[PDB]
Amino acid sequence: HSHGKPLTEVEQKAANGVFDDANVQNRKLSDWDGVWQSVYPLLQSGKLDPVFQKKADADKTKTFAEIKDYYHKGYATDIEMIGIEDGIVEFHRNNETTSCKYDYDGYKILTYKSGKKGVRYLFECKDPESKAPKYIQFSDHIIAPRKSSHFHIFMGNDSQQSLLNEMENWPTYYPYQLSSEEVVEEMMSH
Amino acid sequence: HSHGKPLTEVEQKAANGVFDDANVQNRKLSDWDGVWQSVYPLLQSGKLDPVFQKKADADKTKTFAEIKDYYHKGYATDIEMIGIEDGIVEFHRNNETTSCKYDYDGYKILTYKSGKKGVRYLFECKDPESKAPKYIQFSDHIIAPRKSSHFHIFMGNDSQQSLLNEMENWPTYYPYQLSSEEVVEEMMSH
Ligand SMILES: [Zn+2]
Ligand SMILES: [Zn+2]
Ligand SMILES: [Zn+2]
Ligand SMILES: [Zn+2]
Ligand SMILES: [Zn+2]
Ligand SMILES: [Zn+2]
Ligand SMILES: [Zn+2]
Ligand SMILES: [Zn+2]
Ligand SMILES: [Zn+2]
Ligand SMILES: [Zn+2]
Ligand SMILES: [Zn+2]
Ligand SMILES: [Zn+2]
Ligand SMILES: [Zn+2]
Ligand SMILES: [Zn+2]
């Protein structure tokens, strides 16, 4: 070190933050079906350090430590695991789990300060008996139907716009079955 | 084409059906934590045929078709997906799901007609409100604590002994996130 059909040119550009708004498409929650591990505990045990070292050695300005701090802020979350199936997202803290059958509310295209772009896929929990986040957004470098390989998820109870504003913290999830070594390889290979 | 710590000599022999009973150890249900796809639909759509072809070309007697029929009988199941977490096994048929918090009831060492050996890990559902199988058994070429890569599961409502007798049908589950191509590779690489 690819996980289904290779990417087309539009898809590859899209993954690199280059795309036309007209090529963005709606997605179903099932693109994120599966069980997923938070990568934060891997950061916190030093097991992602090889990733930060490769990134440092390839950037002229940033040190290993600056890069590691960037991902520390980015990955931080107490949601250790996320399960998605049958329209339901389940959030695991410790031995506490919450869940909701989320309603899709479309997407939002963002342009970052760098000029690169990304798409958030928006969902809302309207179950009054749920203790899960009212608003969630998926971001995973994909702009049209395709099974996700890993994702960044924004979670909150205030508004969708509050989450659209969040640029520094993006809890990150890889397939649960991967070993720490396999997560590291994935991070170095895409 | 390995998914955590490489196997030791005892482990490798054990995976090949060679081991001393004294080296068998209890395991927790969490060794099978995750979500898992049935490989039967891959068989049924021709997507495992490359596996059967390699196996045929390496066996002096059996044809591609004889091998494929063996796995057809072996893999057959209507349980398309299995999810395991927090001591609960959840079985998915179509849009119907059942589940139970299973009680561990030890293991059973079997010796096959070939003289090779295997270990079944036994669980029982005692939840009167559950519609899940009363008895289940995991078999996955592992005889001591270790996260499973794939497993064979026996399921029934009669007795544990009935399942111990079953040698021809062994519904088989790989990590849900793998593409069909990745399942095929795994089957050709272990
Ligand atoms: Zn690799
Ligand atoms: Zn679940
Ligand atoms: Zn389903
Ligand atoms: Zn949990
Ligand atoms: Zn990413
Ligand atoms: Zn390697
Ligand atoms: Zn990859
Ligand atoms: Zn490979
Ligand atoms: Zn579940
Ligand atoms: Zn748990
Ligand atoms: Zn289901
Ligand atoms: Zn097997
Ligand atoms: Zn290949
Ligand atoms: Zn493998």
DSSP letters of A100-167? EEPEEEEEEEEE-TTS-EEEEEEEE---TT--S-SEEEEE-S--SS---SSEEEEEESS-HHHHHH--
* Two tokens, residue A138: 């998926």
| Residue A131 alpha carbon to ligand 13 centre in Å | 43
Between the CA atoms of B53, B78, B33 and B48, what dihedral angle is there, to the nearest 10 degrees?
A: 10
Would you call A3 and B179 a contact, using CB atoms and an 8 Å cutoff? yes
Ligand nearest to the CA of B138: 12
Q: Are B173 and B90 in contact, with CB atoms under 8 Å apart?
A: no
- Breaks in chain B at C–N > 2.5 Å: after which residues? 1
Q: Are A123 and A137 in contact, with CB atoms under 8 Å apart?
A: yes
- Closest CA–CA distance from residue B159 to any residue of chain A (Å): 31
Q: Which residues of A are annotated as a binding site for Zn(2+)?
A: 141, 150, 152, 186, 190
Q: What are phi and psi of B79, to 5 degrees?
A: -90, 95
| Residue A139 alpha carbon to ligand 5 centre in Å | 8
| Residue A80 alpha carbon to ligand 4 centre in Å | 8
If we measure between CA atoms, which residue out of A30, A33, A65 comes closest to residue A175? A33
Rounded Cα gap, residues B50 and B35, in angstroms: 25
Rounded Cα gap, residues A98 and A86, in angstroms: 15
How does A11-45 read in b/e, with b if 16+ C-beta sit within 10 Å? beebbebebeeeebeebebebbbbbbbbbbebbee
Question: What domain count does chain B have?
Answer: 1
Distances (CA, A) of A166 to A104, A120, A125, A135, B177: 20, 11, 19, 13, 28
CB atoms within 10 A of CB A136: 25
Would you call B4 and A181 a contact, using CB atoms and an 8 Å cutoff? yes
Distances (CA, A) of A75 to A21, A41, A70, A121, B61: 28, 9, 9, 19, 55
Q: Are B25 and B14 in contact, with CB atoms under 8 Å apart?
A: no
Q: Which value in Å is the resolution of this experimental model?
A: 1.8
Rounded Cα gap, residues B28 and B147, in angstroms: 10
Between the CA atoms of A168, A174, A176 and A179, what dihedral angle is there, to the nearest 10 degrees?
A: -110
Rounded Cα gap, residues A178 and A37, in angstroms: 9
Q: Tell which of A30, A177, A178 to mutate to test the B interface (max B CBs under 10 Å).
A: A177
Single-letter residue type at B185: E
DSSP letters of chain B? ---SSPPPHHHHHHHTT---GGG-----GGGG-EEEEESHHHHHTTTTHHHHHHHHHT-SS--HHHHHHHHHHHH--S--EEEEETTEEEEEETTEEEEEEPEEEEEEEEE-TTS-EEEEEEEE---TT--S-SEEEEE-S--SS---SSEEEEEESS-HHHHHH--S---EEEETT--HHHHHHHHHH-
**Strand, coil or helix: A72:** helix
Ligand 8 is an ion; its neighbours by CB within 5 Å are B 1
Q: Are B165 and B158 in contact, with CB atoms under 8 Å apart?
A: no
Q: Which residues are bridge partners to B78 per DSSP?
A: none
CATH number of the domain where residue B8 is located: 2.40.128.20
Specify the experimental method.
X-ray
* Two tokens, residue B116: 């090779």
- Closest CA–CA distance from residue A38 to any residue of chain B (Å): 14
Rounded Cα gap, residues B26 and B87, in angstroms: 15
Would you call A85 and B83 a contact, using CB atoms and an 8 Å cutoff? yes
B149-156: long-range contacts, CB 8 A cutoff, minimum separation 24: B149/B3, B149/B174, B149/B175, B149/B186, B149/B190, B150/B174, B150/B175, B150/B186, B151/B32, B151/B36, B153/B82, B154/B120, B155/B79, B155/B91
Q: Are B151 and B29 in contact, with CB atoms under 8 Å apart?
A: no
- Closest CA–CA distance from residue A132 to any residue of chain B (Å): 18
Distances (CA, A) of B18 to A58, A172, B23: 48, 41, 11
Q: Which residue range(s) make up the domain with A121? A: 1-190
In B, what residues contact A, Cβ < 8 A? 3-4, 33-35, 81, 83, 85-86, 92, 95, 97, 175-177, 179, 181-182
Would you call A35 and B176 a contact, using CB atoms and an 8 Å cutoff? yes
Q: Are B31 and B148 in contact, with CB atoms under 8 Å apart?
A: yes
